[PDB]
């Protein structure tokens, strides 16, 4: 872990120095997995991008439908540590593809996941995230998924969902964020900060030892890493009076290679934290 602790003043200027940001950012190792770490015929069919693989130490393993088949148990997903190193606060995962939608819902059920955060624009529902929820009701390898209600806000749609399986019913909140920016300029920061704050409140409503929150768009690393890094640093700012975006990004990369994929994404986290520091100081 590298570290660069930013106090208010330094955070605002840092966010506005793209030359220093890219210097810092491209020193951080990607920690991508060697594909020759998964010798598994057909694995590529389960992967949206053939060279974005889950690091093995942190990867989510499915215990269905056949735990004894290494392909049946594979999903492109990693457990992600939260603020302060807490284990399994999030799962970062690719947007499901046609052949992994049942696997995704299998992981939701197996992990008791209470919240999903989807950061894929309405425009990008082609080959970036396969619609994986129903209009009302659907079922996958044992799990009845029902959309009970759709709450529209300015920058996300929240689906309240029930999952029936045998005699168990569970709730699920699906946050579909709709305001991911093309240009990562500061005027695009407030909706992301809003989404982070709403999800944290939802997560705390689950009580002690919240099960993992699933976050995704397409590859499970870039926008996903921004959202988790921003969540982590918001806690850090509230708790410590500083942010350490570099150390947080390093933590994330240890959990899953490529987390926060582009320098524009890295600067955007800085804009968002700069905005929040300002909000807190007034």
Curated annotation (Swiss-Prot):
Name of the protein: Tyrosine-protein phosphatase non-receptor type 5
Similarity annotation: Belongs to the protein-tyrosine phosphatase family. Non-receptor class subfamily.
Binding annotation for substrate: 182, 217-223, 261
Superkingdom of the organism of origin: Eukaryota
Annotated source species: Homo sapiens
Subcellular location(s) per record: Endoplasmic reticulum membrane
Underlying gene: PTPN5
Active site, UniProt feature: 217
Biological function: May regulate the activity of several effector molecules involved in synaptic plasticity and neuronal cell survival, including MAPKs, Src family kinases and NMDA receptors.
Domain (Tyrosine-protein phosphatase): residue spans on this chain: 21-276
Lineage of the organism: Eukaryota, Metazoa, Chordata, Craniata, Vertebrata
